[PDB]
């Protein structure tokens, strides 16, 4: 007979047919999936008196355990079974309630924001309820649904209750972001943005995904703080961090201005770096997992040698700061010294007036001042061989993979900002954000400036042709610009940067997949002109959308500080060596757009930045950012078992992909980053990768590390993030 304990707390006969129907419902349209196999593997685990909910858990997991290269469709079977499970949990049935009835109920529960009820009328919810297509839930992969259930769907974190489904999440996000639009257009915007995100054309970041529609206003996920050379600024920086990490933001800290140990603050940088680290970890589980930062300083800082070894697990406690990452800042001259085999002079930034400023803003001024202070020997200095310093850096980069590079001249010669008024002097955690900052006197200093950026991405595998990006860019810029006015700012200098510059960072996902379906590869140069064509479309249409927005709602207060304002464009300033590795002409009318930008300006000072996506891109089953996949199948752990994901369309494209370790070297990849960088406002999270077995005695030579570094420089790469080393 076999008995089942129902959802309330009573028993009944086991319904073997109802289970079979749900399985058959889930398998519809799927290939290479045995419903019979899942049935055998889950039926054997049942027992007299089993809770109904555990039957669902058992069938889901049974389907999930079969995910593979030979039968990737188990991704979708398992998913739909979970959606089915999640529906019952949330509503007590498969069919979601009517939108209004749901919104009402949730506001009363304090889980949705009450402004929704004010901003929209019942009739307007009836109309939004018709935009929705709940069957789009049938289109998630298993991993995607695990992410929704883990961290996106409005849920009770205490009792483990799920309150909504993915389409309510999407419509309501659309609603809050366009709430302030006029009735004339309000709802048509709402429909179009819902469509774009529910069909995975636009990818949304985690804080937006889990928060917008809820009573929270915390959406800033990355902040950039410059720290001046005084205790007041140090404390101010430290307080800002604590405030931001308590809201889960990732931090980018510039601390290169702090004077060296032994100067006229006797104790130097390291004790303060330690303090910033404890600042970052001040809201972490136990001082480990959670809270992250990258800290930036110039290569020529007097104390640089001590700083290069800071996460080297091989020292004494007093001269180590292991749990932050570091970004070393370099320019043309630093490299020339390496090439010429000469020396590099180390100064404390406090003994060389005007030297730090020029480093970022003016390369020839840096030239004169640098050589000057090298002749002038009343000035405190250390002389080091350029090969040794570069070697040390790369040696620490190689072993930790967590010493980064920033080319500060590229960040300013090829930038949407006038380095004279607003230079770029640092980046964020992952190295894609590149915005102006100003140090603070005090946590509440009005004259300080902390940079903020609001992110999103286009899915290159969900767009059929590049002209779709027009409608999508309008939708993405307008949505994210509305968020700027919606979200809280816990530190006044942060509100300054966001309202003054209105900076955005819209990037890409599914790039590997996109290259695959166009029959191109990373490593051989075959993708060069396609990347040029693809990334020109992206930037032209983002610039266009922000331009229409400036015409509708006025340019950004601090617009006059951009190179855009002076009629300059990315196509005018890019590293000129890109000409030698691609010949794709420009397809869009850049000259008309120049004029239209001259006249009416841009709503946002920056629009584009290529971030790593990781949690995000799972939602739409996509390759991460612009990275090649490590394998065909991605494995993850969870409380619920092994979570597997198959790269999209493996069936037809397995040989079309170029997996990470199939690349003979880094050159091909770096050429594409350079080509992308021609159009990108900010920067790109770009990695270098090395497989020991491709080398004699399994040792990666320094010569190749320095070579790939110089390559990235040659093609106008702004930043270099992770170094990944394969292991046997």
């Amino acid at each position: 007979n076999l008995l089942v304990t129902k959802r309330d707390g009573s028993t009944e006969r086991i319904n073997l047919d109802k289970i079979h129907r749900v399985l058959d419902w889930a398998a519809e349209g799927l290939h290479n999936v045995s419903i019979s196999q899942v049935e055998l593997r889950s039926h054997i685990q049942f027992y007299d008196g089993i809770k109904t909910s555990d039957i669902h858990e058992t069938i889901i997991k049974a389907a999930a355990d079969l995910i593979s290269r030979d039968a990737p469709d188990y991704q979708y079977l398992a998913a739909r079974l979970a959606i089915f499970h999640l529906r019952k949990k949330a509503y007590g049935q498969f069919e979601p309630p009517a939108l209004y009835d749901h919104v009402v109920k949730m506001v009363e529960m304090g889980k949705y924001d009450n402004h929704l009820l004010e901003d929209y009328t019942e009739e307007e919810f009836k109309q939004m309820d018709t935009f929705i297509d709940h069957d789009r839930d049938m289109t998630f992969s298993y991993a995607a649904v695990k992410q929704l259930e883990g961290k996106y769907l409005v849920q009770n974190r205490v009792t483990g209750e799920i309150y909504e489904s993915a389409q309510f999440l999407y419509i309501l996000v659309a609603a809050c972001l366009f709430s302030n639009y006029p009735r004339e257009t309000r709802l048509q915007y709402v429909k179009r943005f819902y469509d774009a995100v529910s069909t995975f054309k636009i990818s949304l970041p985690t804080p937006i995904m889990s928060g917008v529609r809820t009573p929270t206003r915390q959406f800033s996920s990355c902040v950039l703080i410059e720290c001046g050379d005084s205790l007041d600024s140090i404390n101010a920086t430290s307080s800002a961090i604590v405030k931001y990490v308590s809201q889960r933001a990732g931090i980018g800290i510039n601390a290169g201005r702090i004077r060296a140990l032994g100067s006229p603050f006797h104790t130097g940088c390291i004790p303060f770096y330690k303090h910033f680290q404890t600042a970052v970890k001040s809201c972490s589980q136990g001082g480990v997992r959670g809270g992250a930062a990258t800290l930036f300083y110039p290569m020529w800082h007097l104390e640089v040698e001590s700083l290069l070894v800071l996460k080297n697990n091989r020292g004494v406690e007093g001269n180590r700061v292991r749990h932050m990452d570091y970004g070393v800042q370099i320019n043309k001259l630093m490299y020339t010294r390496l090439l010429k085999g000469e020396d590099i002079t180390l100064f404390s930034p406090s003994d060389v007036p005007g030297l730090y400023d020029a480093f970022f803003a003016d390369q020839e001024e840096f030239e004169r001042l640098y050589t000057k202070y090298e002749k002038d020997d009343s000035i405190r200095k250390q002389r080091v061989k350029a090969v040794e310093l570069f070697s040390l850096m790369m040696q620490e980069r190689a072993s930790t993979g967590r010493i980064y590079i920033q080319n500060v001249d590229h960040c300013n010669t090829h930038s949407p900002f006038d380095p004279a008024i607003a230079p770029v002097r640092q980046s964020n955690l992952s190295l894609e954000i590149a915005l102006p900052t100003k140090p603070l006197n005090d946590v509440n200093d009005e004259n300080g400036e902390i940079a903020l950026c609001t992110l999103s991405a286009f899915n290159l595998g969900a767009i059929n042709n590049l002209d779709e990006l027009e409608e999508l860019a309008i939708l993405a810029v307008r949505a994210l610009d509305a968020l700027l006015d919606y979200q809280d700012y816990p530190i006044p200098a942060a509100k300054r940067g966001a309202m003054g510059r209105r900076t955005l960072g819209i990037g890409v996902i599914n790039f590997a997949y996109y290259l695959a379906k166009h029959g191109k590869r990373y490593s051989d140069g075959s993708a060069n002109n396609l990347t040029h064509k693809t990334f020109e479309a992206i930037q032209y249409y983002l610039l266009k959308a922000s331009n229409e927005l400036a015409k509708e709602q006025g340019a950004c207060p601090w617009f006059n500080e951009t190179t855009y304002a002076k009629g300059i464009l990315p196509i005018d300033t890019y590293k000129k060596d890109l000409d030698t590795i691609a010949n794709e002409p420009l397809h869009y009318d850049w000259e008309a757009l120049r004029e239209s930008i001259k006249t009416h300006g841009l709503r946002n000072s920056t629009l584009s930045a290529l971030m790593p996506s990781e949690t995000s891109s799972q939602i739409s089953n996509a390759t991460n950012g612009i990275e090649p996949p490590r394998g065909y199948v991605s494995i993850k752990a969870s409380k619920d078992g092994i979570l597997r994901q198959v790269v999209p369309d493996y069936e037809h494209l397995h040989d079309a992909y170029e997996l990470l370790w199939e690349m003979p070297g880094n050159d091909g990849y770096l050429q594409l980053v350079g080509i992308m960088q021609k159009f990108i406002d900010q920067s790109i999270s770009a990695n270098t990768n090395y497989d020991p077995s491709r080398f004699p005695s399994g040792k990666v030579p320094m010569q190749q590390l320095l070579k790939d570094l110089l390559t990235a420089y040659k093609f106008g790469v702004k930043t270099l993030y992770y170094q990944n080393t394969r292991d046997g």
């Binding site: 190689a398 030579p701 010569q703 070579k707």
Partner: peptide, 16 residues
């Protein structure tokens, strides 16, 4: 682990 193969002549050619 990495090898400190640094050849200054090899490098010096590169144009930035």
């Amino acid at each position: 682990q990495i090898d400190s193969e640094v050849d200054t002549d090899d490098l010096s050619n590169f144009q930035l």
